Design a protein around this ligand. Structure first.
Ligand SMILES: O=C1N(c2cncc3ccccc23)CCC[C@]12CCNc1ccc(Cl)cc12
Ligand SMILES: O=C1N(c2cncc3ccccc23)CCC[C@]12CCNc1ccc(Cl)cc12
Ligand SMILES: [Cl-]
Lengths: 302, 299
């Protein structure tokens, strides 16, 4: 029993964090095999950030301009190449702590763990989700660039995020490990704003099923709804449209609890209308949207 | 920016998790140097000296990854079983066994079959329970804090109470709370809110730009404690006020000034508003957690 926001054990990722320095700039890098991955803005000054020509800035660099530090050992850079917004620093030593890994690009609503790092040293681990507006509500200070987001499946670490910037609203933007940004963001100090954020509906439903599995049923009602009527109501509360894929994905939780997905949709509709009335659901006075259907099954069942 | 419930990096602890099997019971063990620490109920009105004397070293199957460790001795210390093994854990970090106080927070590496599955942050409640997330097989999972390179082990999971909350011991086998490792009627006592932690979290909200709850008012420590007692909040002591000093100096809001905000929040609610994305007053961040997260201390 109990339902917590749980991060994956960060050990496999800690053994990959290194410090990358280029001139005055210092950020984190991910050392996997003989390559260190880091945000390409490590080659920029604060001035360059407005309209940097990365290819022009990178061509002026040599391998010895990039100082890579793994613990108290300086790694030697023997090559460098840019792939989208990530700089790939070829080093002369393969990381002996390299875990089994994949680079995966995630979709909005997906959750992942973040190992927040400063100066190549891990300071904390937390759980978060790719918001529908492609930002993450992270906890990052200056120097956290290069910190990574990941999931672990069996013994394989799936790297899905690398931190690049903080937007003016305090939310965060970054790329997959192939250097492609999530959302319409650019690694430029230009006027960029997070789009209007919405609630991840499929995740709220999964969390309501987690509440049912943990014995919380107060919010259920005798009603059902059509998928379209649910979406018309959901849109009015800034909730993401629920698709037939979402309904299909909730099938296992529906079968386990005996509550049809459209039946749970009607409880959600009522909760949006009534609020919680001094009550909580899994120790929360707000509807939680950072647990996916897969996370609920993993934590409530194993 | 951003304020998340953050756990310490779990790597130093992952290298210590092993599976301990005795009979039909399988749970987790903590392998430090040549000793594996685990709940003594793995041997299971129990007489643990009587049950333990009937077991030999080879009855305890210890598995570290895909390697079976051989047990060469066993002894009990309070509610923890200490299994002497032939091999010292080469991944043993610098460590201490520390007993924490209620209101203190720690990270829990939840494990099943000696394999870590998740890490979360939590607080030792004033009623000595933890609001954790544990399933069958999670026994032996540990709670810890990291200071520089030293892992301070403060908790070992032993059981779940009927209300879904958890109970366990320090690494010396002494239970937190009036609990016993036996199947008997046990219940968590009435819980209270960790006041110093709520104040620390309110300071974290101010540091992150949330100021709506601030007011021009101040209060005495006694008037605040009369209010706090009415709302099942732990008494705030002068030590708590002293501990909040750095946050008070950083934000410019005196501790008793923040108490007047807390008094108004308790008496009137949040009024449809949130603080750090929360509609409830969060009490599982200590003043030190707020400082560490709002400064980027690394390990
Ligand atoms: O956001 C950025 N940073 C930060 C990143 N993450 C959390 C921060 C918390 C406080 C302060 C700065 C933070 C690090 C330095 C680069 C920068 C600076 C602002 N302009 C900018 C624009 C685009 C890009 Cl890709 C990076 C940046
Ligand atoms: O609490 C216990 N368990 C559990 C521990 N943690 C999360 C559980 C989630 C669901 C079910 C059982 C769980 C594991 C097995 C031992 C046990 C069983 C009940 N009787 C009992 C009495 C004393 C002691 Cl110390 C331990 C226990
Ligand atoms: Cl995905």
């Amino acid at each position: 029993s109990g339902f917590r926001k749980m991060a994956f054990p960060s050990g496999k990722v800690e053994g990959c964090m290194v410090q990358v320095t280029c001139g005055t700039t210092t950020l984190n890098g991910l050392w996997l095999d003989d390559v260190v991955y880091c945000p390409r803005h490590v080659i920029c000054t604060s001035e360059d950030m407005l309209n940097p020509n990365y290819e022009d800035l990178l061509i002026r660099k040599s391998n010895h301009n990039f100082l890579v530090q793994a613990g108290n050992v300086q790694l030697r850079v023997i090559g460098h190449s840019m792939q989208n917004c990530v700089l790939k620093l070829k080093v002369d030593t393969a990381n002996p702590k390299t875990p089994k890994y994949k680079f995966v690009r995630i979709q909005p609503g997906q959750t992942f763990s973040v190992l927040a790092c400063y100066n190549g040293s891990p300071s904390g681990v937390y759980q978060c989700a790719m918001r529908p507006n492609f930002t993450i509500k992270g906890s990052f200070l200056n120097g956290s660039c290069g910190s990574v987001g990941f999931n672990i499946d069996y013994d394989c670490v799936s790297f899905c995020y690398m931190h690049h910037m903080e937007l003016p609203t305090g939310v965060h933007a970054g790329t997959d490990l192939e250097g492609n940004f999530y959302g319409p963001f650019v690694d430029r100090q230009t006027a960029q704003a997070a789009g209007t954020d919405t609630t991840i509906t499929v995740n709220v439903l999964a969390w309501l099923y987690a509440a049912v599995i943990n014995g919380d049923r107060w919010f259920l009602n005798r009603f059902t709804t059509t998928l379209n009527d649910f979406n018309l109501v959901a849109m009015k509360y800034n909730y993401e449209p629920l698709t037939q894929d979402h309904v299909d994905i909730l099938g296992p939780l529906s079968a386990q609890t005996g509550i049809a997905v459209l039946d749970m949709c009607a409880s959600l509709k009522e909760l949006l209308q009534n609020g919680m009335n001094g009550r909580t659901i899994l120790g929360s006075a707000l509807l939680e949207d950072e647990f996916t259907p897969f996370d609920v099954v993993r934590q409530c069942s194993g």
